[PDB]
Amino acid sequence: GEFVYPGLVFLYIAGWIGWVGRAYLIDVRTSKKPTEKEIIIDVPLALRIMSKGLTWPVAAIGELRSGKLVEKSANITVS
Amino acid sequence: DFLVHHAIALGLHTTTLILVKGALDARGSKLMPDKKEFGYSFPCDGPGRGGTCDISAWDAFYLAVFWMLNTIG
Amino acid sequence: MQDVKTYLSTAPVLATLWFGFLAGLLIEINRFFPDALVLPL
Amino acid sequence: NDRPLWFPGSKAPEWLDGSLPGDFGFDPLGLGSDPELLKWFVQAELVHCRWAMLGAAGIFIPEALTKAGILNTPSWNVAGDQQYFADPTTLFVIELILFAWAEGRRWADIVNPGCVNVDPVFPNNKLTGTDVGYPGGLWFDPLGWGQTKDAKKLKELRTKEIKNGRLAMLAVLGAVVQANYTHTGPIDNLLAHLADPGHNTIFALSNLVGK
Amino acid sequence: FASKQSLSYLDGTLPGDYGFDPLGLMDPEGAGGFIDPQWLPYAEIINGRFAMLGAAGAIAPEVLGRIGLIPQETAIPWFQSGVIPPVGNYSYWADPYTLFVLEMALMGFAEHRRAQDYYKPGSMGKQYFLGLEKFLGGSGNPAYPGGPIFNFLGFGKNEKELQELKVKEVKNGRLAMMAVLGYFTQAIFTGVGPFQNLLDHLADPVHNNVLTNLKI
Amino acid sequence: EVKIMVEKDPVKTSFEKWAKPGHFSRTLAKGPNTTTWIWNLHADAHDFDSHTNDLEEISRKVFSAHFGQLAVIFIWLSGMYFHGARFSNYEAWLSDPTHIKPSAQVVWPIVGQKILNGDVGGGFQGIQITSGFFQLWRASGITSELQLYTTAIGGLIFAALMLFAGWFHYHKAAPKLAWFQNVESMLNHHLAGLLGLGSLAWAGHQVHVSLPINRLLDAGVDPKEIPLPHEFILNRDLLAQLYPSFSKGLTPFFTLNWSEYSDFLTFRGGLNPVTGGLWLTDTAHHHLAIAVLFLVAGHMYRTNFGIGHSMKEILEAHKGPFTGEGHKGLYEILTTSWHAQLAINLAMLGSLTIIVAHHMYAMPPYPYLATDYATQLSLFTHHMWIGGFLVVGAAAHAAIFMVRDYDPTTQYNNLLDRVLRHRDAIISHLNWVCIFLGFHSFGLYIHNDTMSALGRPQDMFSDTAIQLQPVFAQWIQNTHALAPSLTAPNATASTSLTWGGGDLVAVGGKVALLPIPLGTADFLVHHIHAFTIHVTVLILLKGVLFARSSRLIPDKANLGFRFPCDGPGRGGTCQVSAWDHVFLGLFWMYNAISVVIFHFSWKMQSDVWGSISDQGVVTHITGGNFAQSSITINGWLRDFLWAQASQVIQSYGSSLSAYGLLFLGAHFVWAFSLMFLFSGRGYWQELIESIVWAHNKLKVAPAIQPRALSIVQGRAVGVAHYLLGGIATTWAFFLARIISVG
Ligand SMILES: CCCCCCCCCCCCCCCC(=O)OC[C@H](COP(=O)(O)OC[C@@H](O)CO)OC(=O)CCCCCCCCCCCCCCC
Ligand SMILES: CC(/C=C/C=C(C)/C=C/[C@@]12O[C@]1(C)C[C@@H](O)CC2(C)C)=C\C=C\C=C(C)\C=C\C=C(C)\C=C\[C@@]12O[C@]1(C)C[C@@H](O)CC2(C)C
Ligand SMILES: CC(/C=C/C=C(C)/C=C/[C@@]12O[C@]1(C)C[C@@H](O)CC2(C)C)=C\C=C\C=C(C)\C=C\C=C(C)\C=C\[C@@]12O[C@]1(C)C[C@@H](O)CC2(C)C
Ligand SMILES: CCCCCCCCCCCCO[C@H]1O[C@H](CO)[C@@H](O[C@H]2O[C@H](CO)[C@@H](O)[C@H](O)[C@H]2O)[C@H](O)[C@H]1O
Ligand code: SF4
């Protein structure tokens, strides 16, 4: 109870917030003007994404195994 | 003692961050892809492209000396 | 009224509302469950 | 469309064209500018009105009967702290469970009209209302009134409900504020106003320079 | 025709126009807000009519008490009737704040209706009042509504007599405004009613003027 | 000529532009592409003259925004009055002013905050306040919480009125440009009404309310038994009992027998022995005389009625053989540009605030304020900081005017052009003055340090060693102390007790004021002040004069007012803009004001403030060590910072713990600013590139591209966090020390 239990609770909460933020970013990326939704938040879509974050570990492992979590062709500088 | 060794670890990893960033990005970056033509030490690349103050690797040395002094302190 | 709803969805206003709700929740929790150092469960 | 307004000589706002019952063009802050929010607010007003009518009746009639000596009910302020067959929290949880179902059906009908009109157990009941907020059928309309086909006769009854209910909301707010400000029942307040209208009023309690 | 320059916008069509405007408040060059040239004559007429009522009603009870028509319990000066309780107070059938609320209700009806007629000239005779909306349609000039109530005897049937009556109204109104200001100042300096002040100036004119009353 | 000119319904009232964040700018309205857009939006918001080019819209926006600031100030005043009416011990303090600590803030019990509710006295627990509102309310004659609550309600009503006025005058009835340019009428109306009528009204309040109530309070009458203020107006018998000259009415006023009113309109110096504050009868005669003088002054300038002076002709008349065209052309500048007016007003307001601080410690105007040491220190330091900030802003906005609104066509051979033509001589001579002052003062301090370290105290610049006496200041003190006998014979005592002549005023066993000796250390410290002030002036004046061009960059005015550099060429052109000159002037102003407040604190604690006992023996807080220990830098470091910081670092576990917490936090923030100050943008941009790669690897890169802060933004953030840290450190240190030992 000194470390491990609060650590697990924090990990759950932080994974929840991070996962829902990433999901909202991905959903906004394909829009007419993503930057406008980037400053002015689409409240209904945000609420839907936020509510779907209860089971974030399962979705995270799902996308890790499905190969839809990481990217391979990203911008880099002159090596 | 626990807290102080952890602050020391913070200082070590941060100074290493600055020095390694200076060494690896010495040959070029996205902001200035031809840094290797300007040598180790040069002031800047002008105010264009948003401003390029403290852009060379010598400046990374300069910044990391402060962190070294803080960590040893 | 649509313009008002659009203004209320801006980043500073939403951040203010969200952080106010979060701070209120934490303050009330600490009012009813104070001095919590280790997790009993 | 020249209909009476809340403010004679003024101009009715564009979003209020007089279709809804009880539409006197009253919207100084323009809260009904958005049509979807306007429908949501129509439903909210209907619900607040009906709840306030029930509350006003249940507040005022028992106090009048108690004052006349017919009944012996306590004051509506103290009825929360009375000895009932169960702990209130249990009654509150039962209340939440039942309104979960009722409010859920109402919410589903508001969001998607015409989707919860059939009894889920026996599929041959089929509430016969065509407008959101007016369920009709047998359970909520046993006597058949409000299912008539006469034009502007439904608007008449709906305006009747709208107006008695707005009065009920104002009355309930008044009862609450009066109980908080003068520590006595509403009927005693009415009898005080009737005993000496000139001096028995809101200014009677306060201490002011003039009087 | 009197007072100061002819300001080139006070031609003379207004009743009581004598081209008196040293501060140029009614210049129609920049004329927004409440300094509109169509609002100032109306406002002058309104504070004037209210001042006529106020002067008559502030001098009447004391004169009536001196003659003896009304009981001497009601012959109190105007500032000892309840306007200023710290100075003097009278007990009516209601406390003064309930009276104020009722007065504000009635005057709110009357004044908001009059305002709506000023801003919307044809209104107040269209929607259903309690049967009286027929007589409440002001004809033309907002300051002169007329009709079977506001002019129920039929004065000023022809234009010229109406002009004379308008001029008479303006002068009696301005005179009463100055009279009410005098009532206020003389009440502050002397502490007695204006009628008592008049009798004092009449009894000993040289020793009962403003120069003597510098000490209160 | 002078008349009301407005436009009906210029701007329609709607929420549409509230959903367009950057509507006011034509480039910001297109939306964001990088994170620079957010900073640009919040940075250009209230810079009206950069959006449009017509003076009418700018003037209307300025008028409405000033209405808004007035509404905010009214909300603040109402809040202070309400929080004093409901969460204070003002009545208990009224009963016993010398033992009850003022308190008007109460904290909730949540996370151990209880410890901040200290035992201030009067059966009350709360934070001790140093704003001096209790003294002001007592001087106003307030004796109940009902009056404070009424004042709070009135303040809220006034805030609503100001908000409505701002909305009205922008969105409904906007004045035209010809209305704003009536400077003669504006000066007449403001100078007569706002000043003279306001002073006359306050004099009336004092005479009719404050004099009797404070007279009864000073006599010893219990506050609950004192009659209410209107009872002195409705019943003049009481006021004649206190001041017998009221029994004559206003007859002496109109017959010019003004000497009859000499019992409540006095001219006496010094302080009230009971309360340690200025006599309120003097305050009456002086707000009355100020009212008369301002009312006479306000009838000077020409308007619609012929008589009066015309400012344009006055400016065009004063010119001579040394200055060419003289003051010609200034009227158009000052009636055309808002920035020149802002510069002049900021300079005057800052100087006035500094004068207020000096005059307020030297002649305490409120009862029981001189013996409340925390309030004195707080008020002095606060208004001194405010004045410094305003005087720096004057130079900033003057440079803005020079860059933007200057027009060489109108200014051919007037004072502005001739100042711009001999600027090298000005800057050179001022540089020499700065160097000379710095050497012959700080070198004196270093010489003293070296002599003390070498064991040769007979070779120091001290009172016992080689002396440097301030003979001019001593002569001025002696002259001002002998005024009530020769040059101001109608005065009873001198203007203040700080002059050499006079005696001691003690209230409740504490010294209120006392003659202030001046010696070698005072000579040194005023010449330090002169050094720092001339250096700050040098920086700001060099920024203003070289704002348009120099030898290095002939076309600086094309680059604008706020630009980072002009590249690494010509050897390097970093910080050549007037904005960076303001950026450095801020640091030097901080230095100067810090030295000033340290001098004030040490000198007061060492030579004025203290406790007095029977037989009239005075013991000072630090025992008169300023004369000997302030002549060395080591002396300062040991006997001021090390000695007087013992209270703030030992405040943990008491009601003063918040001061120690903020002491540490301010040291932290000041350190934090150095990372913005010492670094450059390219490093952070490349680090952000790496971090953006990291976020890209997980498909979570933002749509708005992250960017490092601009160069000017980096400088601004550094200076802001630096100033906040330093000032908060000094704030916590002063408050902890003076609350503990005061
Ligand atoms: C209390 C102090 C004052 C507070 C603010 C008061 C605002 C009053 C109205 C201002 C606008 C006046 C011009 C109207 C016209 C206008 O603004 O633009 C006009 C525009 C017209 O939209 P429509 O879709 O109706 O018409 C479009 C046309 O092309 C065809 O009809 O919008 C409106 O009419 C909405 C009006 C209200 C907009 C604000 C609604 C919400 C206000 C209150 C927010 C807070 C609520 C808190 C509740 C507790
Ligand atoms: C007043 C009120 C709402 C008022 C709203 C107003 C004026 C809004 C005005 C405007 O928005 C418009 C229209 C248009 C906008 O442009 C402008 C404004 C001006 C903003 C609701 C009351 C609503 C009142 C309600 C719902 C009352 C319910 C009562 C109940 C349920 C009572 C239950 C019990 O009393 C019993 C029966 C007996 C015991 O058991 C005890 C209990 C349990 C207490
Ligand atoms: C409305 C009014 C008085 C109303 C009085 C009322 C209702 C009294 C009511 C009561 O008393 C009773 C009956 C009985 C009492 O028991 C109770 C009360 C309630 C007390 C006075 C207006 C009074 C109005 C006055 C005095 C106006 C004066 C204006 C002047 C002098 C203007 C001058 C210029 O404007 C010009 C003409 C041209 C410009 O260019 C230059 C200048 C110089 C600015
Ligand atoms: C700009 C003005 C703002 C304030 C407006 C209200 C002013 C009120 C104060 C003015 C009255 C002055 O009051 C002063 O003279 C009054 C007589 O005139 C005296 O009044 C005295 O004589 C009166 C008869 O004349 C009696 O009715 C009083 O009982 C008696 O006290 C007061 O004892 C004295 O204090
Ligand atoms: S300010 Fe920066 S970019 Fe400009 S010259 Fe200096 S170092 Fe180079």
Interatomic CA distance for residues F464 and F694, integer angstroms: 69
Q: Domain tally for chain C?
A: 1
Q: Check CB contact under 8 Å for A42 and C14.
A: no
> Is E30's CB within 8 Å of F230's CB?
no
How far from chain centre, in Å, is Cα F613? 36
User: What does DSSP say about strands F125-128 and F118-119: parallel, antiparallel, or unpaired?
Assistant: antiparallel
Residues 6+ apart with CB under 8 A from F512: F271, F276, F364, F370, F371, F497, F505, F506
Residue D48 lies in a domain: yes
- Domain span holding position E173: 39-212
Q: Which atom of ligand 4 is nearest to the CA of E190?
A: 18
Give the closest of C4, C10, C34 to F15, CB-based: C4
Residue E20 within a domain: no
Q: For residue D164, is it within any domain?
A: yes
Chain D residues touching E94 at Cβ < 8 A: 197-199
**Ligand 5 centroid vs F582 CA: distance in angstroms?**
18
Please state the residue numbers annotated as binding site of A for chlorophyll a: 16
Question: Taken in order B41, B42, B45, B51, is the CA torsion positive or negative?
Answer: positive
Domain assignment of residue D29, yes or no: no
**Residue F565 annotated in ligand binding:** yes
**Parallel, antiparallel, or unpaired: how do β-strands F6-8 and F173-175 relate?**
antiparallel
By CA distance, what is F563's nearest residue in B? B47
Q: Can you give the residue range of the structural domain that contains D121?
A: 35-195
Q: Which of F277, F256, F260 is nearest to F268 (CA)?
A: F277
Sign (positive or negative) of CA dihedral D9, D10, D16, D20: negative
Identity at D15, one-letter amino acid code: W
Tell me whether residue F434 is annotated as binding.
Answer: no
Contact (Cβ atoms closer than 8 angstroms) between residue B54 and residue F574: no
Which helix (H) or strand (E) segment holds residue F321: the answer is: none
User: Which of F408, F169, F452, F574 is CA-nearest to residue B43?
Assistant: F574
Cβ neighbors of F418 (< 8 A, separation 6 or more) are F323, F324
Which chains lie within 8 Å of chain F at 3 or more CB pairs, if any? Answer: A, B, C, E
Tell me if chain C has a CB within 8 Å of the CB of F703: no
Q: Which of D15, D29, D38, D53 to mutate to test the pocket of ligand 2 (most atoms within 8 A of CB)?
A: D29
Atom of ligand 1 nearest to the CA of D28: 8
Q: Is F335 helix (H, G, I), strand (E, B) or coil?
A: helix
d(CA A51, CA A45) in angstroms, rounded, equals 10
* Helix ranges restricted to H, E151-190: 159-190
Token output for A35: 């930057």
Nearest CA in chain E to F237: E216
Q: CB atoms < 10 A from the CB of F664, how many?
A: 13
Q: How far is the CA of E76 from the CAs of E51, E96, E192, F7, F17, in angstroms?
A: 20, 17, 10, 50, 60
Q: Is D58 in the pocket of ligand 2 (CB under 6 A)?
A: yes
Size of interface C-D (CB pairs under 8 A): 9
Any idea what DSSP says for residue F442? I
Measure the CA–CA gap between F493 and F507, rounded to whole angstroms: 19
Q: With contact defined as beta carbons under 8 Å apart, do F461 and F447 qualify?
A: yes
The secondary structure of F578-618, three-state, reads: HHHHHHHHHHHHHHHHHHHHHHHHHHHHHHCCEEECHHHCE
CA F611 to chain centroid: 30
Enter the tokens of residue D61.
Answer: 């009639």
Closest by CA position to F512, among listed F502, F521, F525: F502
Ligand nearest to the Cα of F233, by number: 4
Nearest to F648 by CA among F725, F726, F728, F735: F735
Rounded to whole angstroms, the Cα distance separating F513 from B20 reads 63
Using an 8 Å CB-CB cutoff, list chain F residues near B45. 568, 682
Q: Does residue E17 sit within a domain?
A: no
Residue E175 and residue E158 in contact, taking contact as beta carbons nearer than 8 Å:
no
Q: What is the dihedral of CA E113, E119, E123, E129, to 10 degrees?
A: -10
Confirm or reject: Cβ of B32 under 6 Å from ligand 5: no
In this structure, the residue with its CA closest to atom 31 of ligand 3 is: E178
> Which residues in chain C have Cβ-Cβ distances shorter than 8 Å to A41?
9-11, 14
| Measured distance CA(B32)–CA(F102) in Å, rounded | 61
Q: Which of residues 3-42 of B touch A (CB under 8 A)?
A: 25, 27-30, 33
Gaps in chain A following residue numbers (C to N > 2.5 A): none
CA F677, CA F727: separation in Å to the nearest integer? 17
Domain assignment present for D89: yes
Q: Note whether F602 and F626 are within 8 A (CB).
A: yes
Cα angle: E78, vertex E79, E81; to 5 degrees:
75
Q: Find out whether the beta carbon of D15 lies less than 6 Å from any atom of ligand 1.
A: yes
Cα angle F357, F359, F362; round to 5: 105
Q: Are the C-beta atoms of residues F633 and F445 closer than 8 Å to each other? A: yes
Q: How far lies F343's CA from each of F46, F50, F393, F397, in Å? A: 17, 18, 7, 5
Q: What is the resolution of this structure in A?
A: 2.7
A39 and C38 in contact by Cβ < 8 A?
A: no
Q: Which long-range contacts (CB under 8 A, 24 or more apart) does E47-52 make?
A: E47/E173, E47/E177, E48/E169, E48/E170, E48/E172, E48/E173, E48/E174, E48/E176, E48/E177, E49/E169, E49/E173, E51/E173, E51/E176, E51/E177, E51/E179, E51/E180, E52/E172, E52/E173, E52/E176
Does residue D119 belong to the interface with chain C, where contact is any CB pair within 8 Å? no
CATH code: domain of residue E105: 1.10.3460.10
Interface probe with B: pick from A3, A75, A76, A78, most Cβ of B within 10 Å: A78
* Residue E1 resides in a domain: no
Q: For chain F, say whether B61 makes contact (Cβ under 8 Å).
A: no
Q: For strands F118-119 and F511-513, give the pairing.
A: unpaired
Tell me, using a 6 A CB cutoff, whether residue E216 lines ligand 4: yes
For residue D134 the two structure tokens come to 């007016």
Q: If DSSP codes are grouped into helix, strand and coil, which group holds residue F470?
A: coil
What's the gap in Å between D163 CA and the centre of ligand 2?
Answer: 13
Q: D145 among the known binding-site residues? A: no
- Joined together, the tokens standing for residue D149 give 């086909």
Place of tokens 């500073």: C12
Sign of dihedral through CA atoms F160, F161, F162, F163? positive
Beta carbons within 10 angstroms of residue D19's beta carbon: 8
What's the gap in Å between the CA of F65 and the closest CA on chain A? 26
- Which H/E stretch holds residue F278? none
Token pair, residue E103, equals: 């007065």
State both tokens at F705: 């591209």
Q: Where are the alpha helices (DSSP H) in E31-158?
A: 40-67, 96-119, 147-150
Alpha carbon distance A75, A25 (integer Å): 19
* Structural domain range at position C39: 1-41
Structure tokens belonging to residue F576: 């050549």
Spatial CA neighbour of F277 closest among F269, F266, F285, F288: F269
d(CA F147, CA E90): 27
Give the C window 1-40 contacts with A, CB below 8 Å.
6, 9-11, 14, 38-40
The pair of three-digit structure tokens given for residue B8, joined into one six-digit string:
């020391």
Q: Which residue lies with its CA nearest to atom 4 of ligand 4?
A: E188
* Helix residue ranges, H only, F44-144: 55-86, 90-95, 133-140
Q: Are B32 and B40 in contact (CB under 8 A)?
A: no
Q: Which two tokens stand for residue F249?
A: 């009415």
Paired tokens of F134 = 């209790």
**Per-position b or e across D170-184, b if 16+ CB within 10 A of its CB:** ebbeebeebbeeeee
Q: At what angle do helices F578-607 and F520-545 cross, to 10 degrees?
A: 170
Sheet holding F103-105, edge to edge: F103-105, F125-128, F118-119
Q: Which residues contact D90 (CB under 8 A, 6 or more apart)?
A: none
A40–C6 CB contact, under 8 Å: yes
The answer to whether the Cβ–Cβ distance between F710 and B51 falls below 8 Å is yes
> Which residue of C7, C13, C14, C27 is the best one to mutate when testing the F interface, meaning the one whose CB has the most F CBs within 10 A?
C7
The vertex-F225 CA angle with F219 and F227, nearest 5°, equals 90
d(CA E89, CA D209): 11
The number of folded domains in chain F is: 1
To the nearest whole angstrom, how far is the Cα of F248 from the nearest Cα of chain E? 6
Contacting residues of F for A40, CB less than 8 Å apart = 19
Amino acid letter, D52: A
Q: What is the DSSP string of C1-41?
A: -HHHHHHHTBHHHHHHHHHHHHHHHHHHHHHHS-S--S---
* Number of domains chain D is built from: 1
Pick among A16, A40, A45 to test the C interface (most C CBs inside 10 A): A40
Contacts of E157 (CB under 8 A, 6+ apart): none
For residue F351, CA distances in Å to E60, F357, F380, F390, F391 come to 61, 10, 14, 8, 7
Q: How many domains does chain E have?
A: 1
Is F675 among the annotated ligand-binding positions? Answer: yes
Residues of F in contact with A32 (CB under 8 A): none
| Cβ-based contacts of B29 with chain A (< 8 Å) | 77
What is the residue-wise DSSP string for F337-392? -HHHHHHHHHHHHHHHHHHHHHHHHHS--STT-TT-HHHHHHHHHHHHHHHHHHHH
Residue type for position B23: A
3-class secondary structure per residue, F162-212: HHHHHHHHHHHEEECHHHHCCHHHHHHHHHHHHHHHHHHHHHHHHHHHHHH
Q: Is F46 exposed, middle or buried (0-12, 13-18, 19+ CB in 10 A)?
A: exposed
Calculate the CA F154 to chain-centre distance.
26
C-alpha of residue B55 to centroid of ligand 5, in Å? 10
Q: H/E/C letters for each residue in chain D?
A: CCCCCCCCCCCCCCCCCCCCCCCCCCCCCCCCCCHHHHHHHHHHHHHHHHHHHHHHHHHHHHHHHHHHCCCCCCCCCCCCCCCCCCCHHHHHHHHHHHHHHHHHHHHHHHHCCCCCCCCCCCCCCCCCCCECCECCCCCCCCCCCCCCCCCCCHHHHHHHHHHHHHHHHHHHHHHHHHHHHCCCCHHHHHHHHHHCCCCCCHHHHCCCCCC
- Do the beta carbons of residue F486 and residue F480 sit within 8 Å? no
- Structure-block tokens of residue F532: 């720092």
Per residue, what are the HEC states of E1-53? Answer: CCCCCCCCCCCCCCCCCCCCCCCCCCCCCCCCHHHCCCCHHHHHHHHHHHHHH
